[PDB]
Amino acid sequence: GPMAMLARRQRDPLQALRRRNQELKQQVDSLLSESQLKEALEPNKRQHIYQRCIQLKQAIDENKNALQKLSKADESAPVANYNQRKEEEHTLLDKLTQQLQGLAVTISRENITEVGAPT
Numbered sequence: 001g002p003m004a005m006l007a008r009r010q011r012d013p014l015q016a017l018r019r020r021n022q023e024l025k026q027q028v029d030s031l032l033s034e035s036q037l038k039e040a041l042e043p044n045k046r047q048h049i050y051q052r053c054i055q056l057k058q059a060i061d062e063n064k065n066a067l068q069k070l071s072k073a074d075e076s077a078p079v080a081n082y083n084q085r086k087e088e089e090h091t092l093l094d095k096l097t098q099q100l101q102g103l104a105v106t107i108s109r110e111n112i113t114e115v116g117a118p119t
Helices: 013-035 043-069 081-108
Strands: none
């Protein structure tokens, strides 16, 4: 068509995924922005942050699954820096996973109301 001049040329799934990963990071930073607020000391907000944390964690794990599935070694695509960027992407997403996971548990243990196991 009349758009035969795409300078982007986003072939590699790594680039598409990285775009989404960068977006996830912005959401994580935003979540931390909530956990950084004094108004977030509100008991109710803790559960709300906990919910947002689980959602993002699910999203990152989803990307991690996608990234693992987009490892076409049977195809002549993984060339040196390709595998390097793929591994480094694991490093970033993993820390974000741990960042949320650690925070989530920390917040989840702010609900020390039930000291037993009721049905």
